[PDB]
From a paper:
Here we show that Bdellovibrio bacteriovorus utilizes a small ankyrin repeat protein, Bd3460, to protect itself from endopeptidase activities during entry of prey. We demonstrate that endopeptidase complexation by Bd3460 prevents cell wall decrosslinking, and that both the Bd0816 and Bd3459 targets bind this self-protection protein via a common epitope. Previously, we assigned prey cell rounding to the action of two secreted Bdellovibrio peptidoglycan DD-endopeptidases, Bd0816 and Bd3459, that act to modify the invaded cell wall via hydrolysis of the structural 3-4 peptide crosslinks. In summary, we conclude that we have identified and characterized the first ever self-protection protein encoded by predatory bacteria—ankyrin repeat protein Bd3460 from Bdellovibrio inhibits the prey wall decrosslinking enzymes Bd3459/Bd0816 and in doing so protects the predator from the shape transition that this catalyses in prey.
We next utilized a modified version of our original Bd3459 construct (starting post signal peptide with K38 mutated to become the new N-terminal methionine) that represents a more ‘native' signal peptide-processed form of the DD-endopeptidase6. This version (hereafter simply referred to as Bd3459), was co-expressed with the exported domain of Bd3460 and the structure of this complex determined to 1.36 Å resolution. The Bd3459:Bd3460 interaction reveals that AR1-3 of the self-protection protein are located over the endopeptidase active site cleft, whereas AR4-6 contact the final α-helix of the transpeptidase domain (α9). The Bd3459:Bd3460 interface buries 2372 Å2 of surface area, and is largely polar in nature; 13 hydrogen-bonds, 1 salt bridge, 125 non-bonded contacts; indicating complexation largely via shape complementarity. Upon comparison with our structures of the uncomplexed proteins, Bd3459 does not alter in conformation upon binding, whereas Bd3460 undergoes further flexation around the region between AR4-AR5. This observation explains the 4+2 arrangement of the repeats, such that the gap between AR4 and AR5 allows Bd3460 to undergo an induced fit and contact a patch of Bd3459 around the 346-351 loop and C-terminal end of helix α9. To the best of our knowledge, this significant conformational rearrangement following ARP target complexation is unique.
Author numbering:
A (entry chain A): 38 to 438
B (entry chain B): 28 to 220
Write the structure that this text describes.
C-alpha cells in the first residue's frame, strides 16, 4: 500500500531556516538510496570535492626488459574495469607491456563490475579480513586485469574518454607473470624504483557517477573508507548535533543490511534530509560548485535514475531517488521562479506484498514535487550541461610523483 | 513452478546468473510467483535491458500480469525503464494497458508525463490512446495540466488531444490546472482553440 510517511521543504535562502512540512517530519523512516546524499555530504566535508585518490605504482625495471610493479592503493572507490583499461593504456603509453611481478597492498580496491550491474544495485562485498579481500583482488587481477581486453567495452570507454579530452591507446595489452599481495607495512620500495601516480577523477565526479546510477559499491566503499558506522555517528553528531533518534546508519548505500525476515535499513527524519541538503550546498558553494555537480538533474542527466523525470521538474530539479521494500524516496532541490527550494519526500510502500507499489509511489512523489514547484511560480531552468563522469580525467595520466 | 533465484537475478541485473538458470531449462519462464511476477516483469522493473532481450529470445509471454494488473511493459514505464519499454514495444507488447493505482492511468498517460519518445512509440501503435480516459475520466492532458508544462500541452495537442473533455467530477483540463495552481498550463489552456 502506498502512502506518505513525510514530506518537508525549505527555501535555500531562508533567514529563519525553519523547515516546513507535516507532523511526521521529525520521525525516522527508511531512506533507501537517498542515504547516498548523506554519504556525499560526509565525503565532501572529509575530503573536499576536488580530492583525488592517488594510486601509486612503484615501478622497477628487471633484467629481461620487463618491470616489477607494486600498487600502493588509495582506496579509490571507482577502480574497476574502466580505470583498469585506462591504467593499461597508460602502461602501454610508457612502453610497459610485460610485468614480471605485480604486487598490491590492502588499499588497492579492485571490483571489475564497480560501475555495472549487478554491483550498482547489489550488496557490496564487505571483506571481514584483509586476506579475503586480497584473495579476491588477486583473482580479479589474474582473470580480468591481466587478460585480453574486451574490444566492445574498451571502444565504448575510449570514445567517452575522447569526449572529455583524454587520449587512450588503440590496442591495449599487458602480460603479467606473477601476482601477489604485499601489505603496506611490509612493502620495501626498491632503490631502483620510480613512483608513478595514477590519480582518480576528482571526488565530485565520482559522486556524480554514484548519484546518477545509485551506485551501492561506490557509496558503501566511501562510507567504509571514512571509518564506517562508528565514524559516521561521530561525524553527524558533531555536524548536526544529531543522535540515533534523528539518524541511524549502517552503510553508505541505503540498502538492506539484514534479511527479508529482519531488515536493517538506514533511517532518518525528513528534517535531517533538509539539513543535509543545506550543508552539502554550503560546502559545495565554498568551492564554486552546485548540487548539480554531485547529484543528478531531472531530464538532463539521461544516464541517471531521473533521466525521465518530466513535467515541471525537467531541467529545474536536482534529485536523488531511493527504492527499498518499505519505501520510495526522493530528495533534492527545485529551481523555481521564487528561487532554490530543498525538499524531501519519504513514501511508504509494501513492495513485498505488491511489486507495483514502487511505480505507484514514484508518480505520487513526482506529483508532490511538481505541486511544490507550481506553488513557487513554476520552474526555472538551472544552469547545467550534462556531464560525462568517468573514473579518470585529463589529470589522471600516469606521472612521476 | 517459478524460481525465486531466477526472479531475483532478473530484477538485480545479474545476466550471468539468469543464463545459468534459464538454459538449464527446468524453469517455465511463464510461471508466476505468489504475487504474480514473472522473470520478465522482474527484468523490466529493474531496467535490465540485456536480461529482457535474453528473455524475449526465449519467446516468453509478454502479457502476463502481476497482482497489481501490470504487464512487463507497465513495470518498465512505471519504473522509468524507458529503454526497456522501447524494446518491449518493438517486440510487440500491448500498449493499450493500465498501470497500477487508484486512477487506472493508461500506459500512454504515464509515458506522456515523463518520456516523449515512449509516448510517441505508444501512439504509433494506437493513435486513439491520446484521448483514452482513465478510471476518473482523465486523459494525459489533465495530468500535464496539473503537473506539466506548456510544451507538454503542445505535445499532446500535436498528437490529437481533445480540449473539451470533462472528467467524472465535471472538470476540464483547464479546471484542474487552476485547481493545482499551475499558472503556466492554466494560462496556456485558457487560450487553446
Amino acid at each position: 500500500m502506498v502512502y506518505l510517511n513525510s514530506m518537508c521543504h525549505m527555501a535555500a535562502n531562508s533567514k529563519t531556516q525553519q523547515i516546513q512540512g507535516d507532523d511526521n517530519k521529525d520521525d525516522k523512516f527508511p531512506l533507501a538510496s537517498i542515504s547516498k546524499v548523506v554519504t556525499t555530504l560526509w565525503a565532501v566535508d572529509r575530503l573536499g570535492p576536488d580530492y583525488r585518490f592517488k594510486t601509486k605504482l612503484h615501478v622497477t625495471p628487471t633484467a629481461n626488459g620487463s618491470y616489477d610493479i607494486h600498487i600502493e592503493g588509495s582506496r579509490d572507490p571507482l577502480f574497476g574495469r574502466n580505470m583498469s583499461y585506462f591504467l593499461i593504456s597508460e602502461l602501454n603509453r610508457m612502453k610497459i607491456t610485460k610485468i614480471e611481478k605485480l604486487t598490491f597492498d590492502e588499499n588497492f580496491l579492485l571490483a571489475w563490475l564497480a560501475e555495472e550491474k549487478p554491483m550498482i544495485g547489489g550488496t557490496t562485498p564487505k571483506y571481514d579480513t584483509v586476506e579475503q579481500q586480497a584473495s579476491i583482488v588477486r583473482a580479479t587481477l589474474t582473470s580480468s586485469f591481466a587478460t585480453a581486453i574486451s574490444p566492445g567495452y574498451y571502444t565504448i570507454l575510449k570514445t567517452k574518454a575522447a569526449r572529455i579530452g583524454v587520449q587512450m591507446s588503440n590496442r591495449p595489452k599487458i602480460d603479467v607473470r606473477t601476482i601477489s599481495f604485499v601489505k603496506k607495512a611490509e612493502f620495501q620500495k626498491n632503490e631502483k624504483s620510480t613512483t608513478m601516480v595514477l590519480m582518480s577523477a576528482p571526488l565530485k565526479t565520482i559522486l556524480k557517477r554514484m548519484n546518477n546510477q545509485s551506485n551501492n559499491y561506490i557509496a558503501d566503499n566511501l562510507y567504509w573508507n571514512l571509518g564506517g558506522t562508528e565514524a559516521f555517528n561521530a561525524y553527524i553528531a558533531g555536524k548536526m548535533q544529531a543522535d540515533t533518534s534523528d539518524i541511524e546508519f549502517h552503510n553508505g548505500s541505503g540498502n538492506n543490511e539484514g534479511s527479508v525476515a529482519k531488515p536493517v535499513y538506514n533511517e532518518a527524519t525528513c528534517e535531517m534530509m533538509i539539513k543535509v541538503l543545506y550543508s552539502l550546498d554550503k560546502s559545495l558553494s565554498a568551492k564554486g560548485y552546485d548540487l548539480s555537480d554531485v547529484m543528478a538533474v531531472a531530464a538532463k542527466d539521461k544516464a541517471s535514475t531521473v533521466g525521465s523525470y518530466g513535467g515541471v521538474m525537467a531541467g529545474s530539479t536536482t534529485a536523488k531517488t531511493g527504492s527499498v521494500n518499505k519505501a520510495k524516496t526522493l530528495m533534492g532541490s527545485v529551481s523555481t521562479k521564487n528561487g532554490e527550494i530543498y525538499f524531501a519526500v519519504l513514501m511508504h510502500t509494501d513492495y513485498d506484498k505488491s511489486r507495483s507499489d514502487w511505480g505507484v509511489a514514484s508518480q505520487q512523489i513526482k506529483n508532490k514535487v511538481s505541486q511544490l514547484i507550481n506553488q513557487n511560480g513554476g520552474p526555472k531552468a538551472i544552469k547545467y550541461t550534462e556531464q560525462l563522469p568517468l573514473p579518470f580525467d585529463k589529470y589522471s595520466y600516469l606521472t612521476k610523483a | 513452478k517459478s524460481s525465486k533465484a531466477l526472479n531475483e537475478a532478473a530484477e538485480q541485473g545479474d545476466l550471468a546468473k539468469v543464463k545459468n538458470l534459464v538454459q538449464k531449462n527446468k524453469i517455465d519462464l511463464n510461471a508466476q510467483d505468489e504475487t504474480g511476477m514473472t522473470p520478465l516483469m522482474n527484468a523490466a522493473m529493474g531496467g535490465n535491458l540485456d536480461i529482457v532481450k535474453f528473455l524475449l529470445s526465449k519467446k516468453v509471454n509478454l502479457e502476463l500480469k502481476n497482482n497489481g494488473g501490470e504487464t512487463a511493459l507497465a513495470f518498465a514505464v512505471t519504473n522509468d525503464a524507458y529503454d526497456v519499454a522501447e524494446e518491449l514495444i518493438k517486440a510487440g507488447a500491448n500498449v493499450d494497458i493500465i498501470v497500477a493505482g487508484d486512477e487506472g492511468d493508461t500506459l500512454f498517460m504515464r509515458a506522456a508525463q515523463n518520456n516523449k519518445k515512449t509516448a510517441e512509440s505508444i501512439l504509433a501503435k494506437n493513435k486513439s490512446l491520446i484521448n483514452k480516459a482513465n478510471t476518473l475520466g482523465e486523459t494525459a492532458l489533465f495530468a500535464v495540466a496539473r503537473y506539466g508544462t506548456p510544451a507538454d500541452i503542445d505535445f499532446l495537442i500535436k498528437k490529437g488531444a481533445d480540449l473539451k473533455l470533462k472528467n467524472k467530477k465535471g472538470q476540464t483540463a483547464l479546471d484542474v490546472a487552476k485547481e493545482a495552481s499551475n499558472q503556466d498550463t492554466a494560462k496556456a489552456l485558457s487560450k487553446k482553440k
